[PDB]
Amino acid sequence: LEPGHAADQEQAKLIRSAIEHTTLKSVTIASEIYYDPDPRSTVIPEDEEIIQLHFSFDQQSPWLLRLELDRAAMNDKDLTMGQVGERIKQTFKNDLFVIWSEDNDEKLIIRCRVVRPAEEDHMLKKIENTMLENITLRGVENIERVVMMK
Amino acid sequence: KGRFISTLQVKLYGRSSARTIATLPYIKQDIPIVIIFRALGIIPDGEILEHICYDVNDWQMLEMLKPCVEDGFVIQDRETALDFIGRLGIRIQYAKDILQKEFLPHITQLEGFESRKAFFLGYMINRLLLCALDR
Amino acid sequence: SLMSCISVGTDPMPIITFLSEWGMEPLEDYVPHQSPDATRVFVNGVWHGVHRNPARLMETLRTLRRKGDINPEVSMIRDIREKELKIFTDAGRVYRPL
Amino acid sequence: TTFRFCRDCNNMLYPREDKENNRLLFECRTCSYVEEAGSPLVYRHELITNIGETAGVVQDIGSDPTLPRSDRECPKCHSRENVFFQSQQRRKDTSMVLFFVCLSCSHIFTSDQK
Amino acid sequence: LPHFSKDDYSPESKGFVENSYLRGLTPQEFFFHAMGGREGLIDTAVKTAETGYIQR
Amino acid sequence: DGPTMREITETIAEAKKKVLDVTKEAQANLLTAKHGMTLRESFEDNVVRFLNEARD
Amino acid sequence: EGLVEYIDAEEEESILIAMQPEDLEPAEAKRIRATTFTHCEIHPSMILGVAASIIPFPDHNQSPRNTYQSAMGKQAMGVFLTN
Amino acid sequence: KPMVNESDGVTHALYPQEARLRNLTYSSGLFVDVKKRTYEAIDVPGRELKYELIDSESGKVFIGRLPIMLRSKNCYLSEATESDLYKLKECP
Amino acid sequence: FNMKLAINAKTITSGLKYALATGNWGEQKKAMSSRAGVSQVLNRYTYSS
Amino acid sequence: HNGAPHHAIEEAESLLQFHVATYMDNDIAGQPQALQKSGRPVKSIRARLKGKEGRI
RNA sequence: UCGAGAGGA
DNA sequence: TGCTTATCGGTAG
DNA sequence: CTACCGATAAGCAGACGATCCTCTCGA
């Protein structure tokens, strides 16, 4: 620990989460690929309130990537929908359009679309594995099971 | 007993999303399973999948089975399914002889038993995917 | 061990005939969609046929050894959780009496 | 989640998009066959699984004596004669939650409280 | 063991010896004990070969 | 000694119920779920602890 | 007659054996202690081999002590044959 | 039955104690009923096709000796009882 | 037949003699299937041994 | 010395290159082995003073 | 003498 | 536990 | 834009593995 903190329980919990290596593979329940061409009209009845809220780059894609999330997995390892949404957004921004559900919601999902002005289906699958088994979320790599000690 | 240390190590490749799927004697190369089923006279992809996926209700198997079809989609008819070298001289006859004797020595080693040999191969891939799903 | 004994190997053909005489669909003309709870019957780790209700099949086959028609050396298992039935007349198996 | 195949040639279908009408249509490569999409969903991964935890349950379940038996009662039939088994999903992480199957009713009920 | 039922997570079915050496081990305990013994001599015969190579 | 043998018997008897209540806890999904390690890994650890707790 | 059966290691997977035919039968100091037993064990001493059966009370001894004895019993004097 | 013939003499009735003492191989003789047939075809290159179709040797021809197991089905000891086993210099 | 069979019977009797006395389930060539724990000599110290 | 048949000398020279090399090392390479009939190899100089119970 | 096996603290 | 050898993609000429 | 300078992977065999001591059995 930081020398300043002799034996602080909550300071140790702050470190363990800031060092533990985690990824989208460790939180996502299922990775789904749906077809939806209209950006302002989604087939999913759950993905309805979220749509009008986010609307307030150039040419969208008709290929939607939906990612179901575990309410307990994000809770047990300290995660929010806002921090994940920007973590995917920072790795692309101008390359892809990232939409994410509210943290309060009963169902936690991520809506991802391509932005390149159609043979995208087979190309999207390669992007799926990069999001789960390549993009880092917390701490430093190689790191695994971290534990506090008395 | 016939000794013959004949073994068909059916191997499932890919651990992200490159789920391609077997070794055959006397060939120094791995052969995709879809070509093997087409070389046995089973050309339609649906019939091939009926040999593996017994319960056409469960989708999980078919998802892993989806890429091991396109990998050998160039090969379709039995004429093009048997021509794969194996060795060079002239061969379709060399690989034809392998399927009757060398391939699957148990059950029978005569000739007209393609359906019996393909079902054993169909079950082997089934057992390989059963442990891939951790069932 | 004291009780343990090794298998000498009996001919599989006589048993193959009894199995066909009680219900056995040929592997050359098998139906996957038509047959729901397909019990895959294996002879020495080799697929031969399929039977609909193995409950009465196993009941008939289990007493066939006890009578003496089939050698008690030959083994037979019924895996209800995987819908399979393996029968072994192979040479080298260790068996103990109970 | 289910997949369909061409009637003429029983071969694998490839999804094609109508760039004009804006709708999904599954096409064929062996032949020129086409068909309108039944569901917008194309591919599913499912990392965390709950499936196959109650797998391989033939009505001849009472014949297997290896399985342990329980004195619990069903919610609808209230049957006392029951059999059980642990999570059939043979994974490293999976819990030790019991699954009770009845011999004379064919109903299945969990021991889960979460 | 075939004497135990399926998915039996009890200590007695997973190698626990309740009996004293004076009391006498039951056949169930004695076989699991034999496993704990057999593994012991294997750990001897193997690790002793690596040691002779380590010292040299 | 006579009462000592019975006292040793009751030590293993309470331990069996101690394991039984943890076994019943895991059957109802509700469990400690200790950090890093698996739920099953967490169970075995607490079970073997009770087993040797009575032994020593 | 169908009174006894020969069970292979593979066949042992689908059966349940009752060790004690007295204890494991109705409902219900010496050593410590579903009813669907397909088979019955002849005698628990039958799990031992040759030299192992010559060991007196092997259950009361430590397993490596009997394992040491198992091979040691082979190097004994006595009479092997009368001819 | 195991019998080994010696130099300038009849085929000796080889017994288990005899082989153990004389330092000889306890082998039993094997004889097969061979059928020699010829089997000709009066033909020229094309045509060709069929034969249409065309020796009793000595009384069962020798092929070799197999070492026979003690107390086996084809051994003297399988029939022998305790009373006569002592006269054979064999332990019961 | 029979005249050639005399030399052939010797290769068969000695073929069985070689394997059963040495311990190797292969040809007299050596190093081919050299499994020596096959033709092990019978122990005679104790009856139980 | 005599009527040199060009590609018949190399077929014998390779045998001398083999004989001199197997004398020093008969362990030896990727594919050749060399033996002294009856079926058992020759003990080379490399194998004579080789590690563990061999000269050194 | 070479090579193979068995056994010992 | 090493070594060996092509393929690759990149800065500057 | 091409030629060059080094980057990571493809392909890929090597030789070692307790110390001493007892005895038989061949070919």
From Swiss-Prot, chain C:
DNA-dependent RNA polymerase catalyzes the transcription of DNA into RNA using the four ribonucleoside triphosphates as substrates. Second largest component of RNA polymerases II which synthesizes mRNA precursors and many functional non-coding RNAs. Proposed to contribute to the polymerase catalytic activity and forms the polymerase active center together with the largest subunit. Pol II is the central component of the basal RNA polymerase II transcription machinery. Signal peptide: none annotated. The chain holds residues 540 to 637 of 1224 of the full protein. This is DNA-directed RNA polymerase II subunit RPB2. It is found in: Nucleus. The lineage of its organism: Eukaryota, Fungi, Dikarya, Ascomycota, Saccharomycotina. Belongs to the RNA polymerase beta chain family. The binding of ribonucleoside triphosphate to the RNA polymerase II transcribing complex probably involves a two-step mechanism. The initial binding seems to occur at the entry (E) site and involves a magnesium ion coordinated by three conserved aspartate residues of the two largest RNA Pol II subunits. Component of the RNA polymerase II (Pol II) complex consisting of 12 subunits.
Curated annotation (Swiss-Prot), chain D:
One of its GO terms (biological process) is maintenance of transcriptional fidelity during transcription elongation by RNA polymerase II. The modification Phosphoserine is found at S39. A zinc finger (TFIIS-type) spans 70-110. Zn(2+) 1 binds at C6, C9, C28, C31. One of its GO terms (molecular function) is zinc ion binding. The keyword Translocase does not apply. It is found in: Nucleus, Nucleolus. Keywords: DNA damage, DNA repair, DNA-directed RNA polymerase, Metal-binding, Nucleus, Phosphoprotein, Transcription, Zinc, Zinc-finger. It holds the Pfam family Zn_ribbon_TFIIS. One of its GO terms (cellular component) is RNA polymerase II, core complex. DNA-dependent RNA polymerase catalyzes the transcription of DNA into RNA using the four ribonucleoside triphosphates as substrates. Component of RNA polymerase II which synthesizes mRNA precursors and many functional non-coding RNAs. Pol II is the central component of the basal RNA polymerase II transcription machinery. It is composed of mobile elements that move relative to each other. RPB9 is part of the upper jaw surrounding the central large cleft and thought to grab the incoming DNA template. Involved in the regulation of transcription elongation. Belongs to the archaeal RpoM/eukaryotic RPA12/RPB9/RPC11 RNA polymerase family. Present with 2440 molecules/cell in log phase SD medium. Component of the RNA polymerase II (Pol II) complex consisting of 12 subunits. This is DNA-directed RNA polymerase II subunit RPB9. It comes from Saccharomyces cerevisiae (strain ATCC 204508 / S288c). The gene is RPB9.
UniProtKB/Swiss-Prot annotation, chain E:
It is found in: Nucleus. The tandem 7 residues repeats in the C-terminal domain (CTD) can be highly phosphorylated. The phosphorylation activates Pol II. Phosphorylation occurs mainly at residues 'Ser-2' and 'Ser-5' of the heptapeptide repeat. The phosphorylated form of Pol II appears to carry, on average, one phosphate per repeat. The phosphorylation state is believed to result from the balanced action of site-specific CTD kinases and phosphatases, and a 'CTD code' that specifies the position of Pol II within the transcription cycle has been proposed. DNA-dependent RNA polymerase catalyzes the transcription of DNA into RNA using the four ribonucleoside triphosphates as substrates. Largest and catalytic component of RNA polymerase II which synthesizes mRNA precursors and many functional non-coding RNAs. Forms the polymerase active center together with the second largest subunit. Pol II is the central component of the basal RNA polymerase II transcription machinery. During a transcription cycle, Pol II, general transcription factors and the Mediator complex assemble as the preinitiation complex (PIC) at the promoter. Belongs to the RNA polymerase beta' chain family. This is DNA-directed RNA polymerase II subunit RPB1.
From Swiss-Prot, chain J:
It is found in: Nucleus. Mutagenesis experiments demonstrate that the minimum viable CTD contains eight consensus Y-S-P-T-S-P-[A-S-N-G] heptapeptide repeats. Identical and simultaneous substitutions in a number of consecutive repeats are lethal: 'Ser-2' -> 'Ala-2' (14 repeats), 'Ser-5' -> 'Ala-5' (15 repeats), '2-Ser-Pro-Thr-Ser-5'-> '2-Ala-Pro-Thr-Ala-5' (10 repeats), 'Ser-2'-> 'Glu-2' (15 repeats), 'Ser-5' -> 'Glu-5' (12 repeats), '2-Ser-Pro-3' -> '2-Pro-Ser-3' (15 repeats) and 'Tyr-1' -> 'Phe-1' (12 repeats). The tandem 7 residues repeats in the C-terminal domain (CTD) can be highly phosphorylated. The phosphorylation activates Pol II. Phosphorylation occurs mainly at residues 'Ser-2' and 'Ser-5' of the heptapeptide repeat. The phosphorylated form of Pol II appears to carry, on average, one phosphate per repeat. The phosphorylation state is believed to result from the balanced action of site-specific CTD kinases and phosphatases, and a 'CTD code' that specifies the position of Pol II within the transcription cycle has been proposed. Belongs to the RNA polymerase beta' chain family. The C-terminal domain (CTD) serves as a platform for assembly of factors that regulate transcription initiation, elongation, termination and mRNA processing. Coiled coil: none annotated. Residues 26-43 are annotated as: Rudder loop.
